[PDB]
From a paper:
Phosphoinositide-dependent protein kinase 1 (PDK1) is a master kinase that phosphorylates at least 23 AGC kinases at the activation loop, a site required for their activity. A linker connects the phosphoinositide-binding PH domain to the catalytic domain, which contains a docking site for substrates called the PIF pocket. PDK1 does not require binding to PIP3 to phosphorylate substrates such as S6K and SGK in vitro or in vivo. These phosphorylation events are mediated by a phosphorylation-dependent docking interaction between a C-terminal hydrophobic motif (HM) present in substrates and a regulatory site called the PIF-binding pocket (PIF pocket) in PDK1 (18, 24–33) (top). Here, we used a chemical biology approach to show that PDK1 existed in equilibrium between at least three distinct conformations with differing substrate specificities.
The angiotensin II type 1 receptor blocker valsartan inhibited PDK1 dimerization (IC50= 32 μM). Des(oxopentyl) valsartan did not disrupt PDK1 dimers, suggesting that the oxopentyl moiety was important for the interaction and disruption of PDK1 dimers. The effect of valsartan on WT PDK11-556 but not PDK11-556 [L155E] suggested that valsartan binds to the PIF pocket as well. In agreement with this prediction, valsartan but not des(oxypentyl)valsartan inhibited the interaction between His-PDK11-556 and biotin-PIFtide. To further understand the binding mode of valsartan, we crystallized PDK150-359 in complex with valsartan. We solved the high resolution structure of the PDK1-valsartan complex, which showed that valsartan binds to the PIF pocket of PDK1. Three molecules of valsartan produced a strong electron density at the PIF pocket and were modeled. Therefore, valsartan molecule #1, located on the helix α-B side of the PIF-pocket, could be responsible for disrupting PDK1 dimers. In such a model, valsartan molecule #1, which interacted with the helix α-B but also extended outwards, could act as a glue between the catalytic domain and the linker-PH domain to stabilize this conformation. Although PDK1 could bind HYG8 and PIFtide simultaneously, valsartan did not further enhance the temperature stability of the PDK1-HYG8 complex. These results are consistent with valsartan stabilizing a monomeric form of full-length PDK1 that is distinct from the monomeric form stabilized by HYG8 and functionally different because it does not bind PIFtide.
Residue numbers in the entry: 70 to 359
């Protein structure tokens, strides 16, 4: 086989605190003894994922993450298993979820909204260029590294579209109610443009402090999405409002940035992004949130 480092094993690490608990996974900070490097190790119990029919999501996460090579994504460095567990060695995003910052500060100023929006747009341009739909983009899945650059995660519900068939639509029903696109609800398929709908909701949330479609329960949220039933608060940055209006469009072929709208060029050219230097965002110093 191709030359590669020795496969790792649990005894190669000292495990420390739990960083997160999921319904079928747990993430633990670990130090690799031989290097002193720190990883976030996602651990899944084989019996549990077998019983709860989660193996396809686990295999999907490994397959999609292994294809990514870009600074705005959590990195999958290695995987291994033992008799009871599967292990993913991921980069550790020390500053946690973007959602945490929205909640603490209430909403972002225009400079920070623009910067973080531009990072997300650049990450989506990369993903869509590889024919990958995220399908569950939301602030909880946009992590922040030590330098406050984004690290998008949660690829177990992502989809690699088939280049051989020029596949544009994916059929699995996945996502989170507040960010799900109208085409997934009504046509039961998603496309790359479904991520641009989620982007619109995220920009709105950064400025307004709440996602645009919101209610106590999921069904009520769905009813608002399909009617495009939302409003802006009064002081919303005007160019950001124009951008959100060009993303939160019911017809998935009419969202700025989608292929039918001639792609990322026109989206990056939107007036909200006038000052952005798109070429090397990950090398730029992020603006301070407070
Ligand atoms: C190492 C974890 C357990 C893996 C394994 O070895 N197994 C379970 C299983 C389940 C689902 C899949 C799967 C993966 C991707 C896409 C679809 C599916 C799937 N498979 N069925 N429905 N969806 C693979 C393995 C055996 C088997 O089922 O082969 C059992 C006997 C323990
Ligand atoms: C409907 C597919 C059902 C499963 C199956 O049958 N497949 C895929 C697969 C993927 C992943 C695993 C897996 C997941 C977690 C941990 C270990 C494993 C694993 N992988 N190998 N052994 N265990 C298992 C099966 C065959 C194969 O893998 O070839 C298809 C492609 C014919
Ligand atoms: C049962 C191990 C032999 C199967 C094997 O070798 N492969 C399939 C594979 C690999 C890794 C996983 C996996 C998924 C989630 C978490 C950990 C692991 C894991 N298990 N062991 N290490 N990582 C599932 C299936 C290779 C590959 O598809 O990459 C082939 C191409 C050589």
């Amino acid at each position: 086989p191709p030359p590669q480092p020795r496969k790792k094993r649990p005894e190669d690490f000292k495990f420390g605190k739990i960083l997160g608990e999921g319904s079928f996974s747990t993430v633990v900070l670990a130090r690799e003894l031989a290097t002193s490097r720190e990883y976030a190790i996602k651990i899944l119990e084989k019996r549990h994922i077998i019983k709860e029919n989660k193996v396809p999501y686990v295999t999907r996460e490994r397959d999609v993450m292994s294809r990514l090579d870009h600074p705005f994504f959590v990195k999958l460095y290695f995987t291994f298993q033992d008799d009871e567990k599967l292990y993913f060695g991921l980069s550790y995003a020390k500053n946690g979820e973007l959602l945490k910052y929205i909640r603490k500060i209430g909403s972002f100023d225009e400079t920070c909204t623009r910067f973080y929006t531009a990072e997300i747009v650049s990450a989506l341009e990369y993903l869509h260029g590889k024919g990958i739909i995220h399908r569950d983009l939301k602030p909880e899945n946009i992590l922040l590294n030590e330098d406050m650059h984004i690290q998008i995660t949660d690829f177990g519900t992502a989809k690699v579209l088939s280049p051989e068939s020029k596949q544009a639509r994916a059929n699995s029903f996945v996502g989170t109610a507040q960010y799900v696109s109208p085409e997934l609800l009504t046509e039961k398929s998603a496309c790359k443009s479904s991520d641009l709908w989620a982007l619109g909701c995220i920009i709105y949330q950064l400025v307004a402090g709440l996602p645009p479609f919101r209610a106590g329960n999921e069904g009520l949220i769905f009813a608002k999405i399909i009617k495009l039933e939302y409003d802006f608060p009064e002081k919303f940055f005007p160019k950001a409002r124009d951008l959100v209006e060009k993303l939160l469009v019911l017809d998935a072929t009419k969202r700025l940035g989608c292929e039918e709208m001639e792609g990322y060029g026109p989206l990056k050219a939107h007036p909200f992004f006038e000052s952005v230097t798109w070429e090397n965002l990950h090398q730029q110093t992020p603006p301070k949130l407070t």
